[PDB]
Ligand binder design. Structure first.
Ligand SMILES: CC(C)(Oc1ccc(Cl)c(F)c1)C(=O)Nc1cccc(-c2csc(C(=N)N)c2)c1
Ligand SMILES: CC(C)(Oc1ccc(Cl)c(F)c1)C(=O)Nc1cccc(-c2csc(C(=N)N)c2)c1
Ligand SMILES: [Mg+2]
Ligand SMILES: [Mg+2]
Ligand SMILES: [Mg+2]
Ligand SMILES: [Mg+2]
Ligand SMILES: [Mg+2]
Ligand SMILES: [Mg+2]
Lengths: 236, 5, 236, 5
């Protein structure tokens, strides 16, 4: 709401400035305001939105992992009772992380996904939906954990189905979707074999399509292919 | 951790 | 005020956790709450306060410099008018930076400095006062700029006078004060010769006192001495 | 920039 008085173009301009200044919280707030203008986002604008929130939530995830590790050690036998503070602060960071994920999911649901008809936009947003449900799953422990995991899976699966029908195997969005869905299988769904199979098949099918690409497209696709290979090396 | 984009 | 219900010891504990998680805004908020309990701060607590706010304001300063550079380039002849957005966003970051500096200066004035009687606490807080007025001076342009610069100078000078009377020349607080006051001379007060003279005399007087120190104290003092040398190399 | 602590 606080961006309601700022022009759409000004919000986009300031998001780019915020990125240059490494002010990712500001960047995300500007892009949220841009989305809330109600118009569809161009390719560049979609990537500004994703970069901003990925940086914000990435920092929260890193902090949550540090605090969770300290909390785990505090609860091993022989450790000294140091009070509720570690749990409280881990919970504070966790709640803020969940709030960011809920905000992103809310933008996707109101109304980016429903207006996205082209494969490049729709797959991009469904990948985001899977990613932010995955981040919620990383911290989930309650009655709803299985439903959170299934929400991530469902969004990734719809994105996968569209990407395989509508994009070449080297399309970087298709590749990044596969990379992340493979990580979902390995880290969230306790399915390392599915993770490895998906990464391998994605890599091999992309390899076979590189011959169709310009030098610049080749650079983009091979960059993500190397991430798939990096994960395969980690996992095998 | 593994790579994601 | 929002930390008013949390125990002092819990705020300190959470400041340390926030540091481990690289959550410096949280760290600063916890330490502000600790200061507002009204008790004096121990040596460790003073350093938690300073680390937290130094990291917060350091990030703001870096962002302000990026944006100011973009703004300067936008106003060179031949550049394209891109509207008020760069100025507006630089001003937004500037106002937030000023707010943080005002908060720190407010904690020092209410009431850390007036209760600080030992040299190690009083010099530390007066150095902080000089540093945060220096950060205000970096962005100042108005009727009050000269008074802001003089406020920094005055705080640094009182700290210097106490440090020379009450601390050995190798004391790391005395050394860091001299380092920063020398930077004030070079970057704020347009006094490079004073900056160089202060850094050199500080370094040489510390060198001559190293023989009195344990191995651990020697490590602490020589670390700051190397920063003085680094600046001298940059400036000569 | 020069070093400060
Ligand atoms: C290399 C990387 C991480 O590959 C990806 C591969 C797949 C997915 Cl799904 C993804 F999200 C990323 C990437 O960012 N590629 C990319 C593609 C198109 C546009 C932009 C862009 C426009 S503007 C902008 C900015 N940062 N100001 C960045 C960036
Ligand atoms: C190396 C460095 C930057 O030297 C300085 C020299 C002079 C000044 Cl005036 C200064 F501010 C720093 C420093 O930090 N020294 C130091 C000294 C005493 C205590 C602590 C400490 C206790 S706890 C803690 C934490 N980070 N949790 C840090 C740290
Ligand atoms: Mg308009
Ligand atoms: Mg919780
Ligand atoms: Mg399959
Ligand atoms: Mg109490
Ligand atoms: Mg201003
Ligand atoms: Mg002198």
């Amino acid at each position: 709401g606080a961006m309601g008085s700022m022009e759409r173009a000004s919000l986009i301009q300031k998001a780019k400035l915020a990125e240059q200044a490494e002010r990712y919280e500001d960047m995300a707030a500007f892009m949220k305001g841009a989305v809330e203008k109600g118009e569809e986002l161009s390719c560049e604008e979609r990537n500004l939105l994703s970069v901003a929130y990925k940086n914000v939530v990435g920092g929260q995830r890193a902090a949550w992992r540090v605090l969770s590790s300290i909390e785990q050690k505090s609860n091993e036998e022989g450790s000294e009772e140091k009070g509720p503070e570690v749990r409280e602060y881990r919970e504070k960071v966790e709640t803020e992380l969940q709030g960011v994920c809920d905000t992103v999911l809310g933008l996707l649901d109101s109304h980016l996904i429903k207006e996205a008809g082209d494969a490049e936009s729709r797959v991009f947003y469904l990948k985001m939906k899977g990613d932010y449900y995955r981040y919620l799953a990383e911290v989930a422990t309650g009655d709803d954990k299985k439903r959170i995991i299934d929400s991530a899976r469902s969004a990734y699966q719809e994105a996968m189905d569209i990407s395989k029908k509508e994009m070449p195997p080297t399309n970087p969005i298709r590749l990044g979707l596969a990379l992340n869905f493979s990580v979902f299988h390995y880290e969230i769904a306790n399915s390392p074999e599915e993770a490895i199979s998906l990464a391998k098949t994605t890599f091999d099918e992309a390899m076979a399509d590189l011959h169709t690409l310009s030098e610049d497209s080749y650079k983009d696709s091979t960059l993500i292919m190397q991430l798939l290979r990096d994960n395969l090396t980690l996992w095998t | 951790f593994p790579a994601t984009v």
